[PDB]
Write a protein that binds this DNA or RNA. Structure first.
Lengths: 48, 50
RNA sequence: CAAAAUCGAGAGGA
């Protein structure tokens, strides 16, 4: 155990595996609105 | 029976501008134009003999 | 002192 150095009672299964990095990053999904622009017909917030 | 058509104000049919200045009109403004066109036309035609 | 359209199609995400 890396925090405390003591063995772990179980044996962990470990080896080399191939991973991918998918295009979906959080920096493209965080959003927040507090009184921004609004639609022209019904004065409700825009979308997106 | 419709004898006095009501014309809704500009806030129900706003005139959205272009990214330039070409002012598109609504669908409903177009339809009101067509109604007034044919209303004048039919008025003149039935006014004379037709 | 608020600047930045609409309508259709398609591909995606949970």
């Amino acid at each position: 155990n890396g925090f405390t150095g003591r063995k772990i009672t179980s044996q962990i299964f470990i080896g080399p595996t191939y991973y991918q990095r998918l295009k979906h990053m959080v920096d493209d999904k965080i959003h927040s609105r507090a009184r921004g622009p609004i639609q022209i017909l019904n004065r409700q917030p825009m979308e997106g | 029976i419709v004898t006095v058509l009501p014309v809704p104000p500009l806030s129900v049919r706003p005139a959205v501008v272009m990214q330039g200045s070409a002012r598109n009109q609504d669908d409903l403004t177009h339809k009101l134009a067509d109604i007034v066109k044919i209303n004048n036309q039919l008025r003149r035609n039935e006014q004379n003999g037709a």
